Design a protein around this nucleic acid. Structure first.
Ligand SMILES: [Mg+2]
Ligand SMILES: [Mg+2]
Ligand SMILES: [Mg+2]
Ligand SMILES: [Mg+2]
Ligand SMILES: [Mg+2]
Ligand SMILES: [Mg+2]
Ligand SMILES: [Mg+2]
Ligand SMILES: [Mg+2]
Ligand SMILES: [Mg+2]
Ligand SMILES: [Mg+2]
Ligand SMILES: [Mg+2]
Ligand SMILES: [Mg+2]
Ligand SMILES: [Mg+2]
Ligand SMILES: [Mg+2]
Ligand SMILES: [Mg+2]
Ligand SMILES: [Mg+2]
Ligand SMILES: [Mg+2]
Ligand SMILES: [Mg+2]
Ligand SMILES: [Mg+2]
Ligand SMILES: [Mg+2]
Ligand SMILES: [Mg+2]
Ligand SMILES: [Mg+2]
Ligand SMILES: [Mg+2]
Ligand SMILES: [Mg+2]
Ligand SMILES: [Mg+2]
Ligand SMILES: [Mg+2]
Lengths: 109, 175, 249, 201, 190, 139
RNA sequence: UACCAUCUGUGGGAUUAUGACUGAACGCCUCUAAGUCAGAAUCCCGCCCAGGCGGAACGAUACGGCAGCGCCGCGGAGCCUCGGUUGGCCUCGGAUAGCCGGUCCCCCGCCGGGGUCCGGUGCGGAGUGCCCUUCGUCCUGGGAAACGGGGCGCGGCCGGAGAGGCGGCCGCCCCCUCGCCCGUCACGCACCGCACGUUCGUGGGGAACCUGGCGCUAAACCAUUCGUAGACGACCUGCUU
RNA sequence: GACGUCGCUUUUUGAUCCUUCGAUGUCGGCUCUUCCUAUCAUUGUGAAGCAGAAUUCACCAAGCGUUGGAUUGUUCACCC
RNA sequence: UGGGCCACUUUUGGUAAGCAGAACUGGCGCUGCGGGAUGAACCGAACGCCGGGUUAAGGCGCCCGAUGCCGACGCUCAUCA
RNA sequence: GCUGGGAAGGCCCGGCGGGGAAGGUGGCUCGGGGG
């Protein structure tokens, strides 16, 4: 019943032109295209959810094929939406262009 | 000398009092500068070109911003300037419409950079004064000298071209 | 630097990949342009090269030196028995070109036509178009077929007739027939469609396709010579007699 | 947003539309661009034609069949501009280039959908009105595209069908207004709720 | 330098009726009707009178290059008004030294054929623009009269014919043969 | 064509800037891009303003150019604009826009229920209307 | 096999230089500024040659035996494997120095087109938009409905060809007056603060088992011949009537 | 186009010595393809001290063509 | 180690040269990194292995991080911009 | 806090007033369109 997370897109890693830093991720959240709108999402949890072959244990449920890399939004990256986030493990490069959930967790509203 | 929006300063200075003339004369300039440090630098430049006086054997007895006397009345401004191109240097007289003297001088700086590719270190402003409407020469100001002036805003180009970035309806320019 | 004496290009670059033809028949690749003011007619035919001989005729060319005198000219003889129209294909023109919309074949297609459809007629069961002529003789299949005709009439822009040669009238070893699409020109699509379905399952002679003393085009496959060198293949100049690793290079 | 984004190319400037499309298609977002024959290019027709003919001149003189392929359709010209703005020698750029699809005219999975517009690439927004421009369809047709007449007739058919559908929609809207005027006395309780919270001026 | 307003006005006679569907002028005098689309120029056009019928064109923040177009549009509309009131006629005379230029007018004044231009055997045929009628004059001997309502069509047809009869590989200071526009008048002369 | 003009006394609507969403009277014109500007009854003191930031309305006040604030203020008050505007439908369109922005969650629920029922009633009446309008049997 | 014999060798478009038309700038003039014209061994295309890790239409689709295959089932039970995704928008043409909507009088075999007239225009008949909206049941009222809802239930008809793979309407019968809004009444694992929950989805692909009804019973390659072909492959042919 | 003066080119010859001396086969011709244009001819033009014919000077233009010989190893040259 | 080479400014021969020869300082050689698309020497800055923050030079349509600012004022149309 | 102990600006029909002018208001003269 109902979505309860905002949809973002893994846009790429933090980088200059010829050096990329894979510990920080760049996220484009749908609907926000300025810094003073990115202010709401500034400490929210975020998740890269994906499927694989083997079964993993699910908290409060039965084992299935879904896996999650957890992270959180850390700050804004440049004048038009585009936050930068920090995950527990660095995100795989096959996730670029794909969906990342922003979870409305720890709440300040 | 770079820019911004300019302020007008009056800088008053003098040579240092030697035990030959115990009271050297004071000199005063109106100087359009980004800040008072640039104002004092330009003062020493101009007064060193005019009088045999340098920053070492001299002092600034006053450096203070001239506020605009009537910043709510639209005035005409005549600027007498000199500058130098890639070839030799030229005298010039420009006219502007503005609320502030420093605003008109800033307008003159951006205009000289636009039309003659002249840099601020090339420009020297030598006179700036408030012209009435019936004494102006330039048609770009005399066309605004009209009491019953009236014009539309014909072709309103959309500016928020990215909010939204994808719409379903094409914009309208007539309003 | 500067090849020092002008000579033109040996051979033509408008003719190359200079490879074996992928077909044996000879594709038209361009039919005549359609104008609906003309009557309905065919635009091509399929013959067989018999041989050559020569003729004697009297020329009527005013101002020419051979005016009202007799000349001898070589001729080529092409045997053209009448072609059997057995099918009809329609084409619609799209922004990607011109695609085939719908083909309709006829009942009772001949064995040389089915021979064209098979690669080994000896070991086959000869089952081609049997379920199709079933739907021709049926009545539920019959209303389906006229629905296809009506849809072709209301949508297609180019119709062509599938006709085969009848090889039993030829002195050749080949019993397998040659099929061909021949564009139908000169009318509305409805007019040429009823005309072609009138001519369906039927013989068309070269007397009806072509006429006396008109100028036509011949499309075919050039006589085969095999792997040749540059002197035969491009007619380059032979190198002098004292050339170490070969002259014909 | 997990649906396809369908843009109408008519009235848009080539490189600006290509840049917008390229960033979208790298970020995800399957994009269809229809009516690529209506795309405009700034600068006059002759100098745009000369730019294309210089491109046609660029040819691998040892093997032109191996050389650069000069596509002629306006859809493929737009596609090659987006290809030039993409990182197409990588798997990511190739996946984005596959995520993009372009068409001449409007083919019929998309003729019965709503087409969007990118105002940052529109000619009326990005060019002064006293400036020359060219048409991608005319440019393509004069550099060797074969299919501008068939596309024009199919577009005329599509416009007739769209006029019929639009007249149906207008009759439905008139009926809905009539129905509001009929039963306003039983929706007056609900109408004032919507007016209170900013819907229904 | 952008002038705030540049404008000027065309008077309209009583027997003409003009309509403005935007930047599209339809002129409706007695000799027919004309229509011209000016949607390549950013001006505004307005009808003023109810019994005097002035037409203003306005430019509103243009520079020099687009302030020219004001007077150009007004002159085009005045040529339309003249074309529907009086109609344009171009009288062009045939000029030859030795070989007489034989002009024959095929169907209903819409085709002209010049036969013996400079003694050549090639027959040149010029198609008139639609709405322009050519004829041989009766008052003077070797003279074409080509008439119409559109000045652009009539003058382009005259220039077509004139550049058709042209001399090649010879001295065009001698060899002065051709057909040249002698005068650009009207019909009904009032 | 061109029903609205930049002139002295023309009332414009400031749409963005520090004075966004405001009403403004044009006092004078400063050189093709700015206007001397004063809203004394809408709490905007006199300054220069870009034509890119202002949008022209249909109200024109009556005072000579470069007049003082008391003159523009009493010209605003005699035939006050704060009642002509706001009961113009541009202004209540803005007002509806901002209350729709301020609409809360429980309000959103009530709007959903009301709009759902209203659409049900309108849709049923539309169905009845077209099924009655199909009663056509004339030669 | 030879200019050492014989045959065949082609059409348009935009335009370049140039020559002009109307016509300002500059109350005159001016091929030029806006707008038009003619224009070539050039250029592009046709014609002709090849035919894409590019498509299309159509044919035939495996036993005399246990022997396969296809279709109609949600018809069932399961296995592996690839994972994305987490409501929909079912559509005028367009203009931008202008648009959009609705009506009274003319015309088109009683709908569409004009001319009035009336609205709106920082687009509210609004993509900053619109439509759907999900905790579920039980007693009990009120209006909304009553000309209804739901049958992967039957049959028929019409429209869609550019890539139609779709959409719409009638007749037969079978269940409910429930579902939409405001209320009354209580109950459900209320799993004791905690993550991958929530859809698309009966997803896609691949083997295998059971279960019925309707059907179908082929080709290709080799070998062999041919010589219109050919280095070899390839290619063109024939083989109980 | 004198006296002067501004350039371009790398089809001349110099100047230089950066690459190559555990090796880049060193003149010319023959053969064959492609490119350039600073156009000799041909297409379309403008100018002339362009009457015609012939010629000269320019422009768009490199699509197409630019030969057979005597002498010389010759590139160049010169003649038929 | 006693083959040096390059750059601002000064400077000799030479028409000049990515030529030859000096002075002064810095570099490269012996040196990676950010920028100059690419590059011994330019511009920034010199380096143990990492996290956070911020910068230089340089940028911010898309490739490609960053203007998706309702940025400011002008100039400019190029049939080799 | 400082500044020209900020400059401008608001209100007090600022009041006795004194002048001055045009990007010239009213009133007048002339020219055009609506009873
Ligand atoms: Mg040569
Ligand atoms: Mg030997
Ligand atoms: Mg004139
Ligand atoms: Mg001559
Ligand atoms: Mg021969
Ligand atoms: Mg020209
Ligand atoms: Mg032309
Ligand atoms: Mg032509
Ligand atoms: Mg050397
Ligand atoms: Mg050296
Ligand atoms: Mg060596
Ligand atoms: Mg070696
Ligand atoms: Mg070797
Ligand atoms: Mg070698
Ligand atoms: Mg040239
Ligand atoms: Mg060629
Ligand atoms: Mg040594
Ligand atoms: Mg040195
Ligand atoms: Mg060393
Ligand atoms: Mg060191
Ligand atoms: Mg270093
Ligand atoms: Mg670097
Ligand atoms: Mg560089
Ligand atoms: Mg760091
Ligand atoms: Mg960059
Ligand atoms: Mg970026």
């Amino acid at each position: 019943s109902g979505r309860l997370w905002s949809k973002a897109i893994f846009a790429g890693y933090k980088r200059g032109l010829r050096n990329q830093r894979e510990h920080t991720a760049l996220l484009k959240i749908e609907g926000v295209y300025a810094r003073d709108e990115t202010e709401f999402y500034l400490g929210k949890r975020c998740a890269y959810v994906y499927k694989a072959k083997n079964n993993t244990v699910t908290p409060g449920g039965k084992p299935n094929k879904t896996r999650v890399i957890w992270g959180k939004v850390t700050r804004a990256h440049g004048n038009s939406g585009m936050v930068r986030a920090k995950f527990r493990s660095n995100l795989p490069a096959k996730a670029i262009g794909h969906r990342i959930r922003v979870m409305l967790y720890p709440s300040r509203i | 000398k770079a820019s911004g929006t300019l302020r007008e300063y009056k800088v008053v200075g003098r040579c240092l009092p030697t035990p030959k003339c115990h009271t050297p004369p004071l000199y005063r300039m109106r100087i359009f500068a980004p800040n008072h440090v640039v104002a004092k630098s330009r003062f020493w430049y101009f007064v060193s070109q005019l009088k045999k006086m340098k920053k070492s054997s001299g002092e600034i007895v006053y450096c203070g911003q001239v506020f605009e006397k009537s910043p709510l009345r639209v005035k005409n401004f005549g600027i007498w300037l000199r500058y130098d191109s890639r070839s030799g240097t030229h005298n010039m007289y420009r006219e502007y419409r503005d609320l502030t003297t420093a605003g008109a001088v800033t307008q003159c700086y951006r205009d000289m950079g636009a039309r003659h590719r002249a840099r601020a270190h090339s420009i020297q402003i030598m006179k700036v004064e408030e012209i009435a409407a019936s004494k102006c020469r330039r048609p770009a100001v005399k066309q605004f000298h009209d009491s019953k002036i009236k014009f539309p805003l014909p072709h309103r180009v959309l500016r928020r071209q990215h909010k939204p970035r994808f719409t379903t309806k094409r914009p309208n320019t007539f309003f | 630097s500067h090849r020092k004496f002008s000579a033109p290009r040996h051979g033509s670059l408008g003719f190359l990949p200079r490879k074996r033809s992928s077909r044996h028949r000879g594709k038209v690749k361009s039919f005549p342009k359609d104008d609906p003011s003309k009557p309905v007619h065919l635009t091509a035919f399929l013959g067989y090269k018999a041989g050559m001989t020569h003729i004697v005729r009297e020329v009527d060319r005013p101002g020419s030196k051979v005016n009202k005198k007799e000349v001898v000219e070589a001729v080529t003889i092409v045997e053209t028995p009448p072609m059997v129209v057995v099918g009809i294909v329609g084409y619609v023109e799209t922004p990607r070109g011109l695609r085939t919309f719908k083909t309709v074949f006829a009942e009772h297609i001949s064995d040389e036509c089915k021979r064209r459809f098979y690669k080994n007629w000896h070991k086959s069961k000869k089952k081609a178009f049997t379920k199709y002529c079933k739907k021709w003789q049926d009545e539920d299949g019959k209303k389906q077929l006229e629905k296809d005709f009506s849809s072709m009439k209301k949508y297609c822009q180019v119709i062509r007739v599938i006709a085969h040669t009848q090889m039993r009238l030829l002195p050749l070893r080949q019993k397998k027939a040659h099929l061909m699409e021949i564009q139908v020109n000169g009318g509305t699509v409805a007019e040429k469609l009823d005309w072609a379905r009138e001519r369906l399952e039927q013989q068309v002679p070269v007397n009806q396709v072509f006429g006396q003393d008109e100028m036509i085009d011949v499309i075919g496959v050039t006589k085969g010579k095999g792997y040749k060198g540059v002197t035969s293949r491009w007619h380059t100049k032979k190198l002098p007699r004292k050339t170490h690793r070969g002259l014909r290079k | 947003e997990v649906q396809v984004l369908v843009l109408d190319g008519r009235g848009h400037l080539l490189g600006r539309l290509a840049a917008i499309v390229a960033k979208q298609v790298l970020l995800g977002r399957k994009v269809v661009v229809v009516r690529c024959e209506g795309i405009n290019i700034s600068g006059n027709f002759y100098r745009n034609k000369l730019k294309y003919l210089a491109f046609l001149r660029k040819r691998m003189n040892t093997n032109p069949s191996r050389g650069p392929y000069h596509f002629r359709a306006p859809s493929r010209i737009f596609w090659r501009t987006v290809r030039g703005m993409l990182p197409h020698k990588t798997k990511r750029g190739q996946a984005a280039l596959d995520r993009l699809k372009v068409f001449d005219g409007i083919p019929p999975p998309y003729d019965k959908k709503k087409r969007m517009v990118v105002p940052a690439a529109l000619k009326v927004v990005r060019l002064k009105p006293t400036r020359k421009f060219a048409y991608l369809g005319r440019l393509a047709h004069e550099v060797g595209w074969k299919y501008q007449a068939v596309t024009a007739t199919l577009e005329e058919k599509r416009k007739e069908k769209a006029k019929i559908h639009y007249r149906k929609k207008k009759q439905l809207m008139r009926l809905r207004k009539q129905a509001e005027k009929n039963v306003e006395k039983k929706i007056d309780k609900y109408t004032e709720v919507l007016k209170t919270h900013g819907l229904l001026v | 330098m952008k002038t705030i307003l540049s404008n000027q006005t065309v008077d309209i006679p009583e027997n003409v009726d003009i309509t403005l569907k935007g930047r599209t002028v339809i002129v409706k005098g007695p000799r027919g009707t004309l229509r011209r689309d000016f949607n390549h120029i950013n001006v505004e056009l307005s009808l003023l009178g109810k019994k005097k019928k002035r037409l203003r064109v306005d430019k509103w923040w243009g520079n020099r290059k687009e302030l020219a177009t004001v007077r150009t549009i007004c002159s085009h509309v005045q040529n339309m008004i003249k074309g529907v009131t009086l109609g344009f006629r171009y009288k062009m005379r045939s000029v030859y030294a030795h070989f007489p230029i034989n002009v024959v007018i095929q169907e209903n004044g819409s085709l002209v054929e010049i036969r013996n231009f400079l003694g050549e055997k090639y027959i040149r045929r010029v198609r008139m623009r639609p709405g322009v009628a050519c004829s041989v004059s009766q008052a003077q001997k070797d003279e074409l009269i080509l008439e119409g309502n559109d000045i652009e069509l009539v003058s382009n047809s005259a220039a077509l014919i004139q550049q058709a009869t042209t001399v090649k590989n010879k001295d065009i200071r001698k060899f002065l043969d051709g057909i040249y526009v002698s005068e650009k008048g009207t019909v009904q002369q009032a | 064509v061109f029903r609205r003009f930049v002139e002295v006394g023309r009332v414009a609507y400031v749409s963005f800037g520090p004075h966004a969403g405001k009403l403004v009277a044009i006092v004078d014109v400063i050189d093709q891009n700015r206007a001397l500007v004063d809203g004394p009854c809408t709490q905007v003191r006199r300054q220069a303003m870009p034509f890119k930031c202002m949008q022209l309305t249909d109200f024109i006040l009556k005072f000579p150019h470069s007049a003082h604030q008391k003159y523009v203020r009493q010209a605003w008050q005699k035939a006050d604009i704060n009642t002509k505007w706001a009961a113009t439908r541009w202004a209540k369109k803005i007002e509806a826009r901002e209350r729709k922005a301020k609409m809360t969650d429980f309000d959103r629920f009530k709007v959903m229920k009301a709009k759902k029922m209203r659409n049900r009633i309108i849709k049923n009446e539309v169905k009845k209307l077209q099924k009655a309008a199909l009663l056509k049997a004339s030669p």
